[model samples]
Target: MSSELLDALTILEKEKGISKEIIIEAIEAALISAYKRNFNQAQNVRVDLNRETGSIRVFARKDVVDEVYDQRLEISIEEAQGIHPEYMVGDVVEIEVTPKDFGRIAAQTAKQVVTQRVREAERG
Candidate 1:
């Protein structure tokens, strides 16, 4: 997310009574879908947007497992332990997987959603 998008969302929050959280959630869903299609695999991914600083980050969550089968969904227990000494089987770890273009993507996506909402409201 860029400062422009954050400013836009702030305006909407005050003027139209729309929360930034809602707008970010919508964009997050879009990113998840795009990532799924682009990556060719379904991995649990999350997009985090900061309203205050307009900082955007994408994260992937995986479980720690022994004798890992799918690295996408599971991190090897030893690896996980290395990351966290207490990490054991079934423990979850979240790793940042943000693409370099995420700020542009977040800005465009959140803008589009806000534009659509504004249009719909104008129609109503």
Candidate 2:
């Protein structure tokens, strides 16, 4: 995401009386679906976007378990412990899996998403 994109979103928030958080959330959701589909991943992930820096980081959720069945979604107790000595079974951890081009991807989609959202908001 570029600074210009962030600036545009901010201006839209004020001019259109739309919540910037709402816009950001929608954009994040878009990125997640596209990313998962494009990359052929069945992932449980969260998007962490730095509003000031215009950077997006995708974090996948992993469950701490005694035995790891799915490497994609579960983490071994030992690995969890390595991350944090106090981490226990059943605890969920977030690991960043951001692609190098994630920022560019977000920037390309964000403008379209923001515009679409604005149009939809006016209709409802």
Candidate 3:
């Protein structure tokens, strides 16, 4: 993550009553959005973030299929089998992508969302 973004997020977490774990989850979700916007990934994609280091990795999940009708959501059994011999139809496969500067953007977005959520939580 960028130093500026990290600093901003840390300050927000300290002052806004937002937990770091919640902020990290929001950041992970935001990175998923950014990943889709920048990489044209599917909605089934999952993203993982390391809050300690502010690193992000995007994961695309596809269902194993006997025959792939939708390339984005399904993959042929043969391909799935090649990747994981134990994988059968209906199993999920995950592919990971590394995005540049994602951590910085995610941290910024997460801080904003968490700040808003904290405010809302305080109100009611």
> Candidate 1: misplaced stretches above 4 Å?
15-21, 40-42
User: How would you order the candidates by TM-score, starting with the best?
Assistant: 2, 1, 3
How accurate locally, in lDDT, is each candidate?
0.70, 0.76, 0.67
Give one digit per residue, the lDDT tens place, for model 3 in 7-91: 5457556744556556556666766776678656444788876655655567778878898878657878899777678888888
- Give per-residue CA lDDT, model 2, range 49-124, as digits (tens): 6667877788778888999878667888899777776888888887788788876787876777788876887888
Clashing pairs in 1: none
lDDT of 1 by residue, 15-101 (tens): 565555576666557666666676647577766666567667778878778878786677888887776778888878878888888
For each candidate, give its TM-score against the true structure: 0.78, 0.82, 0.64
70 Cα displacement, candidate 3 (Å): 2.7
Model 1 earns a TM-score of: 0.78
Strongest candidate by lDDT: 2
